[PDB]
Amino acid sequence: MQDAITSVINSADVQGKYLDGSAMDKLKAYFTTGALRVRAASTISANAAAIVKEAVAKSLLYSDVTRPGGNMYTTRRYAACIRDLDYYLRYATYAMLAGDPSILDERVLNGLKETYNSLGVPVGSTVQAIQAMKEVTAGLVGADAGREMGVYFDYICSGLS
Amino acid sequence: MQDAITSVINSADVQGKYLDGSAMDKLKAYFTTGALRVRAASTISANAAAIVKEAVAKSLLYSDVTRPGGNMYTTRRYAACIRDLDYYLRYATYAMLAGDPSILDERVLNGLKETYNSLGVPVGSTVQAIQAMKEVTAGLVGADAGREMGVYFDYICSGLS
Amino acid sequence: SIVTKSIVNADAEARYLSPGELDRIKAFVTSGESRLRIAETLTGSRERIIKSAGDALFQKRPDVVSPGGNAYGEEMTATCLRDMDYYLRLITYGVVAGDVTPIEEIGLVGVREMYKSLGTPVDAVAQAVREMKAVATGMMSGDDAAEAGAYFDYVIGAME
């Protein structure tokens, strides 16, 4: 768990060197993008349940997975699916605020593949659900904030696949 | 073992549906990236031993693991380490050509953690070796071919960790 | 597919992909556009293919629809047209993939054991795919009909 600042400090410390001009430029880049990160995080905190339910309405609804036999069939499985998608959106917001995806592979992508493979959860359908969540939130917060959200959404989909 | 084409066909077949426009778009994406995949595979087949020896020269040489007591100490262990790194580079090339990491968890990441844990092989040092191999081959084939190599290198490092 | 077959064939041999296999993958990558056009041609007109091929099949082989045959009755004829729809779908998959490993690896391995356990004459199924091939290659241009008839040819060859 480290943001862009802590990773820059960790690189300069593992070097043992002081903060040179490249580290200063990286921190200036983060300190310019931080206000946009803050406003996108507020806008995403506004519409958590709406983004999640629009992602299910785009991908998972009216398909086979909500029908009998699907892994999203029962009300318990539906509630756990909404819980999993809320987790993905919340941690993508955290990784957007930090500017570093270390929290994603520390706390989402750690044992997620083995959990989903033990439960029988389809990984492709949940990857499509995360992609639709990314599409909806990029329609919500704009072009560049949607892109800096979608880089961590693509990180979650890549670590899941 | 399936490429992007076989996974798209398997999704459309498990649906039982015909190939709709999203599958056509996915296959068009693969058929646009395939020539770059071919040229990067030729360039990686050019310099297998050079990429492997530069990865050892970056990470594992002159550290404790090549000294007495390390797991890379003897000539047998050195030869087996070069063999393991050649395996990682070869299968990352295969997964780059297929465009799907199914061969990696089918044929590399299957019993690799338990093998390395039974032998006493350090997993962090070999993860750093694979990361340096990724850095060297991304310096070799360019930005975007290096990225589409590094996604499968990160897949191998994530499944190993 | 082609990429799977080349990767596996280099994989057993403990070598990388040879450059001839690489220009094979490159030529398949370039011909994928025509493959997708043949796939849209086969996908969009599946109703007329299945209908006309079932009509010509039951005209050609009337004993399987006569009382005593397998596909006698309403639901049995519907299941017969469903099996023909399955095989046209696998034809579309094999057209896109550039090789017959979707068709063989899904619906051609134990086809004799399955259709022997159902009580089905397999020659009449070969005639069904023959009529499907006639309607489908009557629907396209010349090289498109040849490229689709290669996979139709593989299905009828794998029947008998």
Binding site: - | - | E47, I50, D55
Partner: peptide, 30 residues
């Protein structure tokens, strides 16, 4: 031949197309 619809188009037990005839046969007041 003419009763045959593609097996993707056929409604299944999760689909609401089975109850659609009841949804259009029932009257809803304005």
């Amino acid at each position: 031949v003419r009763r045959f619809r593609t097996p993707d188009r056929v409604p299944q037990a999760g689909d609401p197309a089975l109850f659609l005839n009841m949804a259009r046969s029932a009257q809803i007041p304005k």
